[PDB]
Amino acid sequence: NQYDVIIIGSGIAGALTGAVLAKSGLNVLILDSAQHPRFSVGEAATPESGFLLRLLSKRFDIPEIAYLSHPDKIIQHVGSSACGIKLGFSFAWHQENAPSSPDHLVAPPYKVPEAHLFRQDIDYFALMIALKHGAESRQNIKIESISLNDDGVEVALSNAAPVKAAFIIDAAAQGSPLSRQLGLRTTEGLATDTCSFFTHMLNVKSYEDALAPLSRTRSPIELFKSTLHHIFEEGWLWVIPFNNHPQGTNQLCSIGFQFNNAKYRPTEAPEIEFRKLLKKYPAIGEHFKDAVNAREWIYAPRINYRSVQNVGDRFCLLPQATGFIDPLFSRGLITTFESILRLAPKVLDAARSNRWQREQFIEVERHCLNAVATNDQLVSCSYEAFSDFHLWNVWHRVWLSGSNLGSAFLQKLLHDLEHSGDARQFDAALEAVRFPGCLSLDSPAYESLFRQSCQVMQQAREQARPVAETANALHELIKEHEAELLPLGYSRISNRFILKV
Ligand SMILES: Cc1cc2nc3c(=O)[nH]c(=O)nc-3n(C[C@H](O)[C@H](O)[C@H](O)COP(=O)(O)OP(=O)(O)OC[C@H]3O[C@@H](n4cnc5c(N)ncnc54)[C@H](O)[C@@H]3O)c2cc1C
Ligand SMILES: [Br-]
Ligand SMILES: [Br-]
Ligand SMILES: [Br-]
Ligand SMILES: [Br-]
Ligand SMILES: [Ca+2]
Ligand SMILES: [Cl-]
């Protein structure tokens, strides 16, 4: 074998995987059919994704990875155009044929800033990390075939000799060639059925200028300095600025709109569907009076999928290649970074003992498949909560409380790793969590709240129950589990801006 590991895809997933494996002493080859620089979706970081990047950095002693968790460090070390700022999530609710109210808002602020990742710059920088640690990169390639044998993997290339390795990691997202050839991917069983239109734009007005200033909203954060979700019965639209950081130079704003295909199927070109949306929701339209498109729209008719398996003797599919649900709540980067964190030590142990069996990587699969199933429940129930603001307001606390517990758990793991300096103990601690792929990771009390709340939302959809009844039932569930959650006052529904500590 020419190499130890072949990685397909040189996006952030493949690049970071390549970096940690090469740093740890594997001969790595990264293959990509495109070349940098190149646009990619997946821009909103979360408290979880930030901690997971710092864990990867700390676990494998690669300081440059930790830079990617902080907007100031990205500006300083990647480049001033490589991110915008994110001080929280924000949700603004709307209804067709009614004026939009700036009191139909929720926006819980973070403790520390996070990033809106300008992926063309972040992903190239990440590949440079891998290249500096000795990973080889071959761009603009064409994979002819991937053979999986009992003594290794063989990848045939157009106009080049075959390459051989002990293991292949598919980090190629929706274009996973390993997923196509293995027949792993399916949409059977998925509660979520959504499409997406997305692009980058110039001259997108801030929420504050376009709709309502801070003095009106009473938000503790500018919605301009947040991942802003405009939600409504049949779908939602994101406003993710890169031009909201005072030290930043990026002029663009990322815009994407998603529809629940059960409620509305688009019939026309992206720009026409966009205009129809702004007519339906004029308040959303106030962002876009002077705005112009800085790339072509991308349309994806169905963004949701899962897999029945994602590891074998000689392969692993990373999360995007395995499964995706929706941009809502930004679980994609979380699932990805944690999967790398779990996979990489196991691949190192496999390469060091020369043992390559499916059972060695079973916990990577367990985490990934569980994460997609959790995210499917989370998102499908959220799309049902879009029908009414008061319902959304109560429902968002189910997600928030879970995410807050998950982030606290990852912070504690990082804290313990930094103090003990013990890598094996961290790996075991991550694997020992009682609910891998779930929002809290390890809280049985929370996962009871989550499961019961999701059952309430599905029953509400199935039986067309009134929204006031559904909201009240969720309120009582939150109250019932309060003591077991973090002491943030989640049951205080009148407080729409839940603060930390
Ligand atoms: C519309 C949309 C919005 C999203 N929004 C968010 C968000 O706000 N927050 C969040 O956390 N996550 C989001 N996600 C999920 C997020 O996109 C992923 O978690 C993340 O981009 C994964 O990065 P990656 O490096 O695995 O894949 P990518 O960044 O897509 O890179 C994959 C690479 O593989 C290459 N490739 C593809 N096919 C082949 C082939 N056959 N052979 C060789 N190479 C190939 C490509 O050229 C590309 O460079 C979103 C997803 C979608 C679809
Ligand atoms: Br740092
Ligand atoms: Br309310
Ligand atoms: Br209530
Ligand atoms: Br209240
Ligand atoms: Ca070797
Ligand atoms: Cl996502």
Automatic annotation (TrEMBL):
The keyword Signal does not apply. It is an enzyme of class 3 (hydrolase). Ca(2+) binds at residue 4. GO terms for molecular function: hydrolase activity; metal ion binding; monooxygenase activity; nucleotide binding. FAD 2 binds at residues 305, 320. Pfam families: NAD_binding_8. Keywords: Calcium, FAD, Flavoprotein, Hydrolase, Metal-binding, Nucleotide-binding, Oxidoreductase. This is Halogenase PltM. The lineage of its organism: Bacteria, Pseudomonadati, Pseudomonadota, Gammaproteobacteria, Pseudomonadales. The gene is pltM.
